[PDB]
């Protein structure tokens, strides 16, 4: 795997692959939920949970019924599945532009 300062390959905003450098490692927590319509999201922010205060009191229990504010502003019902501590990599390209990406998007 990857440490900081390392030179890696990742996709640029322009769509092409370039060598870029790894400047920061962050561990970022994403929530996963199963919506009532049979769909799921595993990349929710904790504060997208509106039926409890997760920044302050942590994640709902696994399998708990929650209400989720989605990206159209509207609230949907769901069940909590998991919180994911995910390795993030802030990468810098030759032109000074930075992205924040996860492991499957960075290449050794």
């Amino acid at each position: 795997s990857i440490t900081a300062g390392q030179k890696v390959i990742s996709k640029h905003k322009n769509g092409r692959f370039y060598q870029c450098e790894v400047v920061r490692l962050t561990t970022e927590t994403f929530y996963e939920v199963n919506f009532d319509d049979g769909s799921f999201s595993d990349n929710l922010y904790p504060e997208d949970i509106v039926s409890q205060d997760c920044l302050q009191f942590g994640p709902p229990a696994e399998g708990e019924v929650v209400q989720v504010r989605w990206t159209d502003g509207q609230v949907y019902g769901a069940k909590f599945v998991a919180s994911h501590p995910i390795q993030m990599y802030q990468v810098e390209f030759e032109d000074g532009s930075q992205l924040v990406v996860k492991r499957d998007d960075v290449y050794t």
């Binding site: 199963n34 919506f35 049979g38 769909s39 799921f40 999201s41 990349n43 922010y45 989605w70 990206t71």
Partner: peptide, 9 residues
């Protein structure tokens, strides 16, 4: 990026 959804199974 914003959260996204998809069908499972």
């Amino acid at each position: 990026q914003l959260a996204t959804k998809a069908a499972r199974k």
